[PDB]
């Protein structure tokens, strides 16, 4: 919604497209909403000033087209044998639907396209992809009740999402691998409930909504730029980066509360072994977050000296500072929240 | 089995559609060519199922409308491809 | 003015829209006239329709001449 | 009966379609198949109304991609594959042989043609496509058609914005 | 049929998309079954709708009858290829065209 | 009985095929005489008796003349394209309404739309197959024609369809029993002829041939056998499209004799126009279809949606 | 259908026979390296016809695909006018044709209907 | 689907004298035939709609065919020549057997039947109207409503809602 | 438009006098066929498990 009146439209039609999917009482109706959503995102994603952006507009299109195509294939097949939108006892035909939806959201085994399209997106584009585009796919998976297929994606998601991220330096590509891990937590939270998932998703989007602005406001795209980034008060820069820890889910900060409620419910449901692989793998995710904090926690750096000044947008920064404040002090407000009980 | 005598042929055709959509051809248009091939087969099955209903074939129009838009959108992205890379070859894109 | 410019540049869209506007008008007359006659209840019915003398519909049989 | 032979041809043309490389070879293969699928669909339906529509819709897409094929992939090559011609011709006759010695009451699709319907079915004596296409324009499903309209019009805004006409023609530079 | 979680007014738009309630041999069969789903809810309905689901599926999917039909045809051919039938009396008398 | 019925259907198609094939030969003569009289010329008058056997006297030459095997052409495509051009021209005649049944054809109006669109590929493939610069320009000049007339064609057919109530062409007879739709649809009749010209690629819309802009258009690389069929397929289109104008706007009394007096007259009109108007400019047509015709045609769907609604209330 | 297919084949056979007569009835002479050369006004050609031919109506070309798929939704109108609710049929149809016109006039005013320049 | 316990009437009962009269011959007498057998027709057609069991309407069906056969015996007795000319014309005049062509010969018949049986041709739209009858079957279908005493109960609005015991009860009551 | 409708209704009204006749005929022959099929099924599959 940044340049012209047209961008305003595509954003809204994206909202309508997603809503049609998650409010549809049949597979066919759901599939239509995905098509509406598809063309709402591409024009927002394609810009010809960048040779990279058009490539991003491609990989997404080929992947999503295939996903919706295979998704419709199975849905027709599903009700060719059952004659209902629902299958009484889950079987292979329902697995195929799950496979498409995971690819639609870039879960582990079919995530490859997802980081590899993040090179050529603006930060505001990545947020729309990382947060909103994952609503419709993941929300339909709540209908399907296959365990092992869903379970396998979680185990691979946290692993591939973490180990892959260690080697990156591009923040846009790094966040993609970071997002794959948080995706793993959702699917784990999705085999147990949705209200946790709805809660967990809202917090995940919140943190990503924050980190995207900080890069977007100061146009940072590489790790080196963090060290070269100039800030008046190294205390201020030190505190802004304390959002990564919340994204790492450390308990003193707000970003752990989401992880916390997903464990109090997974454990309640006896999924002990899963949590071991997940929570253990989150450490590796917590690692490269600290590699970013190298530019803040140490707090006297060798920096280029042709800048004395910070030039920043007010409204984005004004909303970013408010969001950051809760991201550090949001824990004591758990008392207020009444959606977990 | 019923599914083998009546629904096997379209499904076997569908997977052959996908294997076109993934095979290595130089030009991006080879993907678009195989794209509406698959759509043609999706219509065929969907038309089997809709006819198990006595009067529900009207939904064929709904499906066709989305078929052209993905093809039409698929063709627009190709146009935007040309005016940044100059050509549509797959091997011309950065491998990442 | 505006009217003049179009009437000089693209006269067909003016004349065409003139009849198009005619369609909406006399569509609004016919549609209102349709429910001014209770035309949902049509004297000639497709298929072989038979009612029981006690059925509620049996009261609403449109009584015409030919 | 021709239904089985239609099954053979659609299979045969699909085998070769997997092996086409030249875009126009793909197009010719696809165009031939669009005829058969259109023909086949009307066999298992009360009318061919949808075959007409499907045929008309795809032909629009057939022309447009030639225009882009002739601008992007103009200079490419064919190669007659003696393996392919024998293989398709070998199976094709093989499949045609089965259709003559098939229990083709069993192979016929159970979907009720117009004649397959009973004589008592009062709803089958109206116009050929009256009821089927009816509720496309009646409450509540009509709003779906309306939703398409914006979707199609909103699409029409997407292409011009993706396309950016003013920055030149298209050439395979 | 699926149950949207959201159930905002948008679901009204696409709810009536595909149904059996328009002049169908299974209109009454589905209404009973799906009603029972509404009474017991979705998950519990799958355990109380044994008859209604099977009947409705055997009314639309028709697998249960088509899969009778082949047993008759195959068993007619098996008899002949075993020599138990004859060429002259292979089939029974055909039905009258003006029937069914 | 029924076994006999389909035999008659074969005879009718063969009878209609040979009769149409013969007429397009004599149409070409008529084109030369009439176009020779609008111009103050006399036209073909020597050959045989008074010129009547002229078109046959040409069919000899175009077949005793050698095939051309272009060096740079994909020969199989170059060789087959004439066949489908002629086939599609004859095949579209099976939907022409007869009260003595030939083919039922409910949704006959659509069958027109499908067949006419196919006629573009044969031009399109022939031009590209020839592999000559002019031939390719002719082919892509023909495709751009379809992009223009195709959409407006369907809408204008829809307007006529609203008047009759169905896509069956037979109903045009019953509704044109007191009068002719020409009166009600005068601008569409005038527009419809204009689009009809684009269908058959005639002056003022002669772009596929493109004579004097392209040397001979997509035909530039054809010779004795192939070129002949391309020619006949061209004039079969005129003859049918002229008839389709007579069933829509001029009574549709197919069993009456006058209907065929009318049919030739509309054929004369097609020649008459060729001797009056210069060719449009390649872009001005596409602008014309989208800027004016498409907007025009949509405007009357409202006019006829309202009129049918208003008429429905009264009846 | 099945009647039409048979005559469709029968015609195709007949038209096919026509050139198969022409190919034999045609005078036969030895083909020359120049006789089969392309025609380009008598001077050898610089450029193959298979070079990329630039396009200027690409935008209209895409719009053509769209506008047809709305022809799929207007055509059924007539067939279901006797059988439908008049308000729903009337309202929806109008807001179908107004949407089309508005779309057309919008692009016409934006100048997209004009060719690349 | 038919099994042994399903009861179909024996073959002899289904046997009954049939018309076996071609289409054009039937369409000729349609308007005069309809005015006579309407009582049987409506009685037969009414049950068939409400009750969709072919064996149940077996008795009424025999009445309908008998009335049709009864009518033609009269025609055979008097206007045999005229009816054949009307039917022949109606058959050999158009492919649809439309009445609009053969108005003349039609008049010849209509005058024969109204001079021999004082009957009148009903108006063109007479039989397309809704026909309301007095059901002799006297068994209009009943009406019922399914009952589920075991439905998943929910919290009723009248239920009182006092404060929760010790609140949230989460961890440290937060 | 009046005259076309006039003719159409007359054609349709002729159906409603013939349509009951056929239904009577079909039922009395539809049932007879069912007995034969129920009997052909018995003979065809005497020895099936
Ligand atoms: C000088 O300035 C000028 C120009 O600038 C250069 C011009 O371009 C022009 C341009 C002029 C035009 C464009 C005029 C329009 C003409 C043309 C486009 C092409 C010219 C050709 C014609 C007019 C001829 C028309 C006919 C054809 C081309 C052939 C069509 C096919 C035909 C007739 C065959 C039909 C098939 C049939 C079965 C008919 C019945 C039987 C036969 C034909 C069989 C014949 C014989 C046999 C089988 C032998 C049997 C024998 C035995 C059994 C013993 C002018 C006028 C000008 O003044
Ligand atoms: C020939 C061109 C003449 C000069 C431009 C038109 C003058 C007549 C004004 C008509 C109203 C505005 C039309 C317009 O410019 O498109 C909407 C333009 C932008 O056009 P756009 O190309 O970005 O696409 C607009 C897409 N929708 C419709 C979804 C928003 O401006 C606006 O959208 C909002 C301001 C409208 C009032 C502007 C005056
Ligand atoms: C994308 C959209 C494409 C829309 C157009 C589809 C048709 C274009 C086909 C062009 C020819 C393809 C080809 O070269 O194959 C040669 C093939 C042979 O393939 P080949 O590989 O042997 O050719 C090369 C030969 N060597 C190896 C010696 C170099 O020949 C044919 O049989 C093609 C017949 C085409 C017939 C004409 C089609 C007209 C259709 C009209 C509409 C339908 C009626
Ligand atoms: C060195 C690397 C390997 C580390 C060890 C990996 C093996 C971890 C154990 C396997 C996964 C979880 C096993 C489990 O589920 O324990 C359940 C056990 C049984 O309790 P119960 O609840 O009654 O069982 C269900 C009802 N029958 O009761 C319990 O155990 C519940 C109590 C919590 C168990 C948590 C076990 C995970 C510990 C992970 C340590 C990771 C390594 C840290 C260093
Ligand atoms: C004797 C037999 C004679 C046979 C003659 C056959 C002629 C066939 C050949 C016709 C084609 C001629 C060339 C052509 O195609 O012209 C099309 C026409 C030209 O106009 P155009 O080019 O658009 O003007 C310049 C644009 N820059 O394009 C047009 O503009 C035509 C647009 C027609 C619009 C008609 C609108 C009619 C409206 C009716 C109502 C008007 C009354 C007032 C409003 C009433 C409201 C209630
Ligand atoms: C069948 C045979 C029909 C022709 C028989 C001709 C008998 C008349 C005497 C011979 C003769 O004159 O033949 C040529 C004839 C007239 O002479 P012509 O070459 O046209 O010179 C100009 C005349 N004003 O010109 C003709 O009419 C000959 C036409 C014969 C070929 C017609 C093409 C169809 C194939 C027929 C076989
Ligand atoms: C080797 C394969 C041999 C199989 C034949 C393949 C060639 C197909 C030629 C037949 C195409 C025409 C057709 O079949 O139409 C079928 C259908 C008619 O349906 P209907 O409206 O009921 O009219 C029936 C009137 N008797 O109407 C339709 O389904 C639409 C037909 C569109 C036809 C386009 C013309 C194609 C010409 C052949 C191209 C090759
Ligand atoms: C009463 C309606 C008044 C509408 C006023 C339009 C007056 C002028 C129309 C015109 O054509 O002038 C040129 C103008 C420039 O638009 P341009 O981008 O150059 O595209 C080609 C236009 N022929 O063309 C345009 O911008 C708009 C042309 C189409 C306007 C149709 C509006 C009809 C509304 C009913």
Dist CA G99 CA A333 (whole Å): 50
CA atoms within 13 A on the CB side of A164: 23
Pair of tokens at residue D131? 């009821």
Among residues H17, H23, H28, which one has the least CA distance to residue H69? H17
Residue H168 Cα, gap to closest chain C Cα (Å): 58
Q: Which ligand is nearest to the CA of D161?
A: 2
Cβ contact (<8 Å) for C39 and F305?
no
| Count of other CB atoms within 10 angstroms of residue F69 | 13
Place of tokens 């129009």: B61
State yes or no: chains G and I have 3 or more CB pairs below 8 A: no
Dist CA F233 CA F87 (whole Å): 8
Dist CA H71 CA H119 (whole Å): 12
What subunits touch chain H, counting only 3 or more CB pairs under 8 A?
A, C, E, F, I
Q: What SS3 string covers chain B?
A: CHHHHHHHHHHHHHHHHHHHHHCCCCECHHHHHHHHHHHHHHHHHHHHHHHHCCCCCCHHHHHHHHHHHHHHHHHHHHHHHHHHHCCCEHHHCCCC
**Residues F220, F223, F229, F235, Cα dihedral to 10°:** 50
CA terminus-to-terminus distance, chain G: 48
Among residues F136, F241, F240, which one has the least CA distance to residue F193? F241
**CATH number of this structure's domain B2-92:** 1.10.287.3510
CA terminus-to-terminus distance, chain E: 33
Question: C49 by DSSP, 3-state: which?
Answer: coil
Among residues F231, F232, F235, which one has the least CA distance to residue F217? F231
Dist CA F154 CA F178 (whole Å): 27
Q: For F120-151, give the DSSP string.
A: HHHHHHHHHHHT-HHHHHHHHHHHHHHHHHHH
Contacts of H152 in chain E (CB under 8 A): 39-41, 44
Cβ contact (<8 Å) for B75 and G66?
no
Dist CA G15 CA F20 (whole Å): 13
Contact A126, A118 (CB under 8 A): yes
DSSP state of G115: P
Place of tokens 């793998």: A281
The finding on whether C9 has its CB within 6 A of some atom of ligand 8 is yes
Contact A120, A53 (CB under 8 A): yes
Cβ contact (<8 Å) for H146 and E32?
yes
**Is the previous residue joined to F96 through a cis bond, with omega within 30 degrees of 0?**
no
Contact D125, I16 (CB under 8 A): no
What subunits touch chain A, counting only 3 or more CB pairs under 8 A?
B, D, E, H
Question: F11 by DSSP, 3-state: which?
Answer: helix
Output the CA–CA distances (angstroms, integers) from residue G58 to D67, D134, F285, F295, G88, in the order listed: 8, 36, 16, 21, 37
DSSP state of G39: P
∠ CA D161-D165-D167, rounded to 5°: 110
Pair of tokens at residue A295? 């530019």
Beta bridge partners of C50: H131
Residue D118 Cα, gap to closest chain I Cα (Å): 10
Dist CA B91 CA D45 (whole Å): 45
Backbone angles phi, psi at A46, to 5 degrees: -95, 125
Give residue limits of the domains in chain A.
Answer: 1-341
Place of tokens 């690349």: G116
Place of tokens 């914006």: D150
Helix (H) or strand (E) segment spanning residue F240: helix F224-249
Pair of tokens at residue D141? 């499903």
CB proximity C14 to G under 8 Å: no
**Is the previous residue joined to D50 through a cis bond, with omega within 30 degrees of 0?**
no
Contacts of B69 in chain G (CB under 8 A): 66, 69
Dist CA A225 CA A229 (whole Å): 6
**Given the CA of residue F296, which atom of ligand 5 is nearest to it?**
34
Cβ contact (<8 Å) for H168 and A334?
no
Residues near G43 by beta carbon (within 8 Å), at least 6 away in sequence: none
Contact A240, A215 (CB under 8 A): no
Query: How far is C-alpha A334 from the chain's CA centre?
Result: 23
CA atoms within 13 A on the CB side of C62: 16
- Gap from CA of F49 to ligand 6 centroid (Å): 9
| Count of other CB atoms within 10 angstroms of residue H6 | 10
Contacts of G22 in chain F (CB under 8 A): 63, 67, 224-225, 228
Pair of tokens at residue H163? 């404060």
Pair of tokens at residue I10? 């007359």
Strands (E), F155-219: none
Residues near D109 by beta carbon (within 8 Å), at least 6 away in sequence: B6, B48, D3, D43, D44
For ligand 4, atom 27: residue with the closest CA: A270
| Count of other CB atoms within 10 angstroms of residue H171 | 8
Contacts of D158 in chain A (CB under 8 A): 10, 39, 42-43
Place of tokens 């005016």: B83
Q: For chain H, give the DSSP string.
A: ---SSS----HHHH--------HHHHHHTHHHHHHHHHHHHHHHHHHHHH---TTTTHHHHHHHHHHHHHHHHHHHHS-HHHHHHHHHHHHHS-TT--TTT-HHHHHHHHHHHHHHS---PPPTTSTTS-EEE--SS-----------TT------TTS--PPPTTTT-SSS--
- Gap from CA of F38 to ligand 6 centroid (Å): 29
Among residues D102, D92, D100, which one has the least CA distance to residue D13? D92
Question: A44 by DSSP, 3-state: which?
Answer: helix
The finding on whether F12 has its CB within 6 A of some atom of ligand 6 is no
Dist CA E96 CA A213 (whole Å): 78
Among residues F85, F155, F165, F92, which one has the least CA distance to residue F123? F85
- Gap from CA of F225 to ligand 1 centroid (Å): 12
Contact D156, B72 (CB under 8 A): no
Helix (H) or strand (E) segment spanning residue F85: helix F75-91
CA terminus-to-terminus distance, chain I: 67
Output the CA–CA distances (angstroms, integers) from residue A337 to A131, A251, E6, H62, H173, in the order listed: 22, 17, 21, 77, 12
The finding on whether C10 has its CB within 6 A of some atom of ligand 8 is yes
- Method of structure determination: cryo-EM
- Gap from CA of F48 to ligand 6 centroid (Å): 6
Residue of G nearest to D153 (CA): G103
For ligand 7, atom 4: residue with the closest CA: G5
**CATH number of this structure's domain G1-110:** 1.20.58.1610
Cβ contact (<8 Å) for I15 and D125?
yes
Dist CA A88 CA D148 (whole Å): 33
CB proximity F311 to I under 8 Å: yes
| Count of other CB atoms within 10 angstroms of residue F19 | 11
Length, in residues, of chain I: 49
- Gap from CA of D24 to ligand 3 centroid (Å): 7
Task: Enumerate helices (H) and strands (E) in chain C, giving the number of each.
Answer: 2, 1
Output the CA–CA distances (angstroms, integers) from residue C37 to C34, C44, C62, G117, I3, in the order listed: 5, 15, 11, 57, 21
Contact H42, H136 (CB under 8 A): no
Which B positions 48-87 lie with beta carbon below 8 A of chain E? 50, 52-56, 59
Dist CA F266 CA F246 (whole Å): 8
Output the CA–CA distances (angstroms, integers) from residue H167 to H161, H171, H173, in the order listed: 13, 11, 7
Dist CA F189 CA A236 (whole Å): 77
Dist CA A191 CA A170 (whole Å): 33
Pair of tokens at residue H84? 């054949």
Question: F214 by DSSP, 3-state: which?
Answer: strand
Contacts of C31 in chain G (CB under 8 A): 86-87, 90
- Gap from CA of H109 to ligand 3 centroid (Å): 65
Question: E96 by DSSP, 3-state: which?
Answer: coil
CB proximity G3 to D under 8 Å: no
Contacts of I20 in chain C (CB under 8 A): 48
Backbone angles phi, psi at A3, to 5 degrees: -110, -60
Residue E49, burial from CB neighbour count under 10 angstroms (0-12, 13-18, 19+): buried
Dist CA A40 CA A22 (whole Å): 16
Among residues H120, D125, H97, which one has the least CA distance to residue C45? D125
Give residue limits of the domains in chain B.
Answer: 2-92
| Count of other CB atoms within 10 angstroms of residue A290 | 13
Q: What SS3 string covers chain D?
A: CHHHHHHHHHHHHHHHHCCCCCHHHHHHHHHHHHHHHHHHHHHCCCCCHHHHHHHHHHHHHHHHHHHHHHHHCCCCCCCCCHHHHHHHHHHHHHHHHHHHCCCCCCCCCCCCCCCCCCCCCHHHHCCCCCCCCHHHHCCCCHHHHHHHHHHHHHHHHHHHHHHCHHHCCECCC
CA atoms within 13 A on the CB side of F155: 30
Nearest to E73 among D106, D110, D119 (CB): D106
Dist CA H66 CA C6 (whole Å): 74
Backbone angles phi, psi at C35, to 5 degrees: -85, -10
Dist CA F272 CA F35 (whole Å): 7
Dist CA A204 CA A186 (whole Å): 9
Pair of tokens at residue F295? 């907007």
Dist CA D61 CA A171 (whole Å): 41
What subunits touch chain E, counting only 3 or more CB pairs under 8 A?
A, B, D, H, I
Nearest to C22 among F292, F306, F313 (CB): F306
Contact D71, D18 (CB under 8 A): no
The finding on whether F292 has its CB within 6 A of some atom of ligand 5 is yes
CB proximity C51 to G under 8 Å: no
Contact A78, B49 (CB under 8 A): no
Dist CA F194 CA D170 (whole Å): 31
Backbone angles phi, psi at H133, to 5 degrees: -125, 170
Among residues D53, D58, D50, which one has the least CA distance to residue D128? D50
Helix (H) or strand (E) segment spanning residue C50: strand C50-52
Interface test with G, best of F76, F86, F157 (most G CBs within 10 A): F86
Question: Inter-axis angle of helices G58-74 and G86-110, to 10 degrees?
Answer: 170
Dist CA C39 CA F309 (whole Å): 12
The finding on whether G114 has its CB within 6 A of some atom of ligand 8 is yes
Residue E67 Cα, gap to closest chain A Cα (Å): 13
Cβ contact (<8 Å) for E13 and D105?
no
Q: Count interface pairs D-G at CB distance under 8 A.
A: 128
Place of tokens 């419910």: A265
- Gap from CA of F53 to ligand 6 centroid (Å): 8
Dist CA H20 CA H16 (whole Å): 12
Dist CA D97 CA D106 (whole Å): 16
- Gap from CA of A176 to ligand 7 centroid (Å): 52
């Amino acid at each position: 919604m940044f340049n012209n009146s047209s961008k305003i439209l595509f954003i809204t039609i994206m909202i309508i497209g997603t809503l049609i999917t998650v409010t549809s009482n049949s597979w066919l109706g759901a599939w239509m909403g995905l098509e509406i959503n598809l063309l709402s995102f591409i024009p927002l994603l394609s810009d010809n000033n960048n040779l990279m952006s058009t490539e991003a507009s491609l990989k997404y299109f080929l992947t999503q087209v295939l996903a919706s195509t295979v998704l419709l294939f199975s849905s027709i097949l599903l009700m060719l044998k059952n004659n209902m939108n629902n299958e009484i006892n889950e079987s292979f035909t329902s697995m195929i639907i799950m496979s498409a939806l995971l690819l639609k959201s870039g879960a582990a085994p079919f995530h490859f396209w997802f980081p590899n399209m993040m090179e050529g997106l603006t930060w505001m584009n990545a947020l729309m992809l990382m947060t909103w585009q994952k609503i419709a796919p993941l929300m339909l998976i709540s209908y399907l009740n296959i365990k092992y297929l869903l379970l396998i994606s979680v185990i691979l998601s946290v692993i591939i999402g973490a180990i892959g991220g260690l080697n990156q330096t591009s923040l846009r590509k790094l966040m993609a691998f970071s997002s794959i891990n948080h995706l793993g937590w959702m699917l784990s939270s999705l085999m147990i409930s949705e209200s946790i998932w709805l809660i967990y998703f809202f917090f995940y989007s919140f943190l990503s909504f924050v980190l995207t602005f900080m890069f977007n406001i100061f146009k940072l795209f590489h790790l080196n730029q963090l060290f070269s980034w100039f800030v008046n008060s190294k205390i201020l820069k030190f505190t802004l980066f304390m959002n990564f820890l919340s994204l790492g889910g450390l308990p003193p900060f707000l970003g752990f509360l989401p992880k916390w409620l997903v464990i109090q419910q997974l454990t309640l449901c006896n999924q002990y072994f899963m949590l071991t692989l997940m929570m253990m793998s989150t450490l590796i995710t917590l690692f490269f977050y600290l590699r970013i904090c190298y530019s803040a926690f140490m707090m006297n750096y060798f920096e280029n000296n042709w800048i004395m000044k910070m030039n920043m947008n007010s409204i984005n920064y004004n909303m970013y500072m408010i969001m950051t404040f809760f991201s550090i002090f949001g824990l004591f407000l758990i008392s207020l929240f009444y959606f977990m009980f | 089995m019923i599914m083998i005598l009546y629904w096997s042929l379209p499904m076997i055709l569908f997977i052959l559609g996908l294997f076109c959509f993934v095979s290595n051809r130089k030009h991006l248009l080879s993907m678009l060519l195989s794209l509406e091939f698959i759509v043609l087969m999706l219509f065929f099955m969907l038309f089997i199922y809709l006819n198990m209903l006595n009067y529900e074939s009207y939904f064929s129009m709904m499906f066709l409308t989305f078929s052209v838009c993905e093809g039409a959108l698929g063709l627009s992205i190709l146009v935007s491809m040309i005016r940044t890379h100059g050509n549509d070859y797959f091997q011309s894109f950065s491998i990442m | 003015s505006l009217l003049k410019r179009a009437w000089n540049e693209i006269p067909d869209i003016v004349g065409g829209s003139a009849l198009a506007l005619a369609g909406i008008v006399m569509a609004t007359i016919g549609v209102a006239n349709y429910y001014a006659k209770d035309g949902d209840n049509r004297r000639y019915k497709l298929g072989y329709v038979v009612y029981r003398h006690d059925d509620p519909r049996a009261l609403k049989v449109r009584n015409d001449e030919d | 009966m021709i239904q089985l032979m239609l099954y053979s041809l659609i299979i045969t043309t699909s085998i070769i379609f997997l092996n086409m490389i030249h875009p126009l070879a793909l197009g010719l293969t696809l165009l031939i198949q669009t005829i058969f699928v259109c023909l086949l669909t009307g066999l298992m339906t009360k009318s061919f109304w949808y075959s007409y529509i499907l045929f008309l819709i795809f032909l629009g897409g057939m022309l447009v991609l030639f225009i882009y094929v002739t601008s992007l992939a103009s200079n490419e090559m064919f190669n007659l594959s003696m393996k392919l011609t024998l293989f398709s011709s070998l199976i094709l006759i093989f499949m045609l042989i089965l259709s003559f010695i098939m229990d083709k009451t069993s192979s016929s699709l159970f979907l009720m043609n117009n004649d397959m319907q009973s004589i008592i079915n009062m709803n089958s004596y109206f116009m050929e496509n009256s009821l089927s296409l009816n509720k496309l324009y009646n409450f509540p499903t009509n709003f779906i058609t309306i939703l398409l309209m914006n979707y199609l019009l909103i699409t029409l805004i997407v292409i011009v914005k993706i396309t950016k006409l003013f920055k030149g023609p298209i050439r395979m530079m | 049929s699926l149950t949207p979680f959201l159930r905002l007014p948008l679901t009204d738009l696409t709810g009536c998309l595909i149904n059996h309630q328009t002049y169908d041999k299974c209109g009454k069969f589905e209404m009973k079954m799906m009603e029972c789903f509404e009474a017991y809810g979705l998950e519990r309905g799958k355990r109380e709708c044994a008859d209604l689901i099977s009947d409705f599926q055997e009314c639309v999917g028709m697998q249960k009858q088509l899969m009778r039909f082949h047993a008759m045809r195959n068993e007619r051919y098996k008899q002949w290829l075993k020599g138990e039938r004859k060429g002259q009396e292979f089939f029974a008398d055909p039905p009258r065209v003006d029937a069914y | 009985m029924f076994y006999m019925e389909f035999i008659l259907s074969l005879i009718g198609s063969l009878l209609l095929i040979i009769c149409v094939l013969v007429s397009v030969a004599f149409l070409t003569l008529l084109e030369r005489k009439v176009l020779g009289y609008i111009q103050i010329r006399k036209g073909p008058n020597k050959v045989g008796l008074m010129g009547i056997p002229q078109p046959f006297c040409d069919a000899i030459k175009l077949f005793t003349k050698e095939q051309t095997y272009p060096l740079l052409s994909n020969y199989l495509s170059y060789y087959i394209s004439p066949i489908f051009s002629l086939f599609l021209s004859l095949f579209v005649w099976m939907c022409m309404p007869f009260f003595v049944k030939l083919y039922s054809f409910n949704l006959g109006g659509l069958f027109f739309l499908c067949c006419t669109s196919l006629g573009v590929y044969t031009v399109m493939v022939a031009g590209w197959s020839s592999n000559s610069n002019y031939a390719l320009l002719g082919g892509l000049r023909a495709v751009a024609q379809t992009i223009s007339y195709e959409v407006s064609l369907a809408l204008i057919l829809l307007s006529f369809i609203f008047l009759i109530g169905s896509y069956n062409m037979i109903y045009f007879f019953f509704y044109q029993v007191y009068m002719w739709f020409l009166i009600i649809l005068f601008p569409m009749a005038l527009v419809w002829v204009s689009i009809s010209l684009a269908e058959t690629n005639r002056t003022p819309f002669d772009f596929a041939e493109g004579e004097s802009e392209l040397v001979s258009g997509f035909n530039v690389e054809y010779s004795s056998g192939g070129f002949a069929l391309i020619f006949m397929a061209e004039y079969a289109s005129i003859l049918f499209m002229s008839m389709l104008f007579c069933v829509i706007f001029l009574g549709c009394d197919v069993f009456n004799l006058l209907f065929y007096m009318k049919l030739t007259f509309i054929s004369f009109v097609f020649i008459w126009v060729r001797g009056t108007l210069p060719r449009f400019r390649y872009d001005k047509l596409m602008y014309l279809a989208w800027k004016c015709f498409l907007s025009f045609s949509l405007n009357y769907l409202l006019f006829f949606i309202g009129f049918k609604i208003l008429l429905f209330s009264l009846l | 259908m099945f009647s039409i297919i048979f005559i469709a084949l029968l015609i195709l056979l007949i038209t096919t026979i026509v050139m198969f007569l022409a190919s034999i009835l045609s005078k036969k002479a030895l083909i020359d390296r120049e006789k089969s050369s392309p025609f380009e006004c008598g001077f050898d050609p610089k450029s193959s016809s298979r070079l990329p031919f630039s396009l200027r109506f690409f935008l209209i070309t895409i719009i053509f695909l769209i506008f047809d798929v709305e022809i799929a939704l207007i055509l059924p109108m007539i067939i279901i006018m006797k059988y439908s609710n008049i308000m729903i049929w009337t309202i929806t149809s109008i807001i179908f044709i107004l949407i089309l016109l508005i779309g057309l006039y919008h692009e016409w005013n934006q100048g997209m209907l004009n060719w690349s320049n | 689907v038919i099994t042994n316990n399903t009861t179909l009437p024996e073959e002899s009962e289904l046997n009954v004298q049939e018309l076996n009269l071609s289409s054009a011959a039937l369409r000729a007498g349609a308007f005069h035939l309809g005015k006579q057998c309407e009582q049987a027709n409506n009685e037969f057609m009414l049950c068939r709609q409400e009750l969709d069991d072919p064996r149940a309407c077996l008795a009424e069906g025999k009445a309908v065919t008998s009335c049709a056969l009864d009518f033609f015996r009269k025609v055979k007795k008097t206007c045999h020549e005229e009816f054949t000319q009307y039917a022949t014309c109606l058959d050999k005049s158009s492919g649809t057997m439309a009445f609009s062509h053969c108005r003349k010969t039609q008049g010849v018949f209509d005058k024969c039947i109204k001079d021999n049986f004082d009957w009148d041709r009903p108006s063109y739209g007479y039989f397309s109207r809704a026909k309301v009858i007095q059901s002799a079957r006297e068994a209009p279908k009943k009406e019922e409503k399914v009952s589920y005493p075991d439905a998943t109960p929910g919290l009723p609005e009248d239920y009182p809602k006092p404060p929760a015991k010790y609140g949230s009860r989460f961890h440290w009551l937060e | 438009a009046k005259k076309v409708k006039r003719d159409e209704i007359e054609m349709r009204s002729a159906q409603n006098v013939i349509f009951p006749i056929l239904v009577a005929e079909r039922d009395r022959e539809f049932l007879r066929q069912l007995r034969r099929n129920r009997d052909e099924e018995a003979e065809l599959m005497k020895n099936v498990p």
